[PDB]
Amino acid sequence: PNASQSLLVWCKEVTKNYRGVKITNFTTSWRNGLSFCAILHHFRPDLIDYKSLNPQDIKENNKKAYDGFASIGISRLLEPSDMVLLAIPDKLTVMTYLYQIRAHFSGQ
């Protein structure tokens, strides 16, 4: 498997069985914030209450995840307002961001 495929497989393994998460790509699957928040919850459940998240709170879900990640050393590549007005998230930015999250937890 190539670098994209292996990253996508990692995202699905880590978020497996989180309610409301459905990952099929590096764009619309990430918009609502849940997928990011599930990644955060899986590693650092002390930083976020996943069960109380509202699927329609696009800005707030994204903010919680970005702030959680920034608090452990992962640089912000996305702002919550990049999701506003139904924008499709930039593919290369989402991928790089996830790449950095996985690298952080792999000791890089």
């Binding site: 190539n2 670098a3 994209s4 290369l92 790089t96 950095q100 690298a103 890089q108």
Partner: protein, 92 residues
């Protein structure tokens, strides 16, 4: 002082080469992603993009470790700097 700046200078130079190659890999990889013109160069650029990300991450971690040490030195300079003020106060 001596060890730190030598190492920071070298890392900061290497960081300049990384960011320079990466701007070009990005420009290109973005062009291919948007056009769909060559999914094979695309994948090869993605790989290179990520290698460059790995290098930069390893530099950043090395820099931060060194910066801690530099802060600990500086504090020590300040400790000795205070000892001088005490000395000079006694030179009557």
């Amino acid at each position: 002082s001596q060890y730190v700046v030598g190492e920071l200078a070298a890392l900061e130079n290497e960081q300049k080469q990384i960011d320079t190659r990466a701007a070009l890999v990005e420009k290109r990889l973005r062009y291919l992603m948007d056009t769909g013109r060559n999914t094979e160069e695309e994948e090869a650029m993605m790989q290179e993009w990520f290698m460059l990300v790995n290098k930069k991450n390893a530099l950043i971690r090395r820099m931060n470790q060194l910066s801690l040490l530099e802060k600990e030195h500086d504090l020590e300079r300040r400790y000795e700097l205070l000892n001088r003020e005490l000395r000079a106060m006694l030179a009557i």
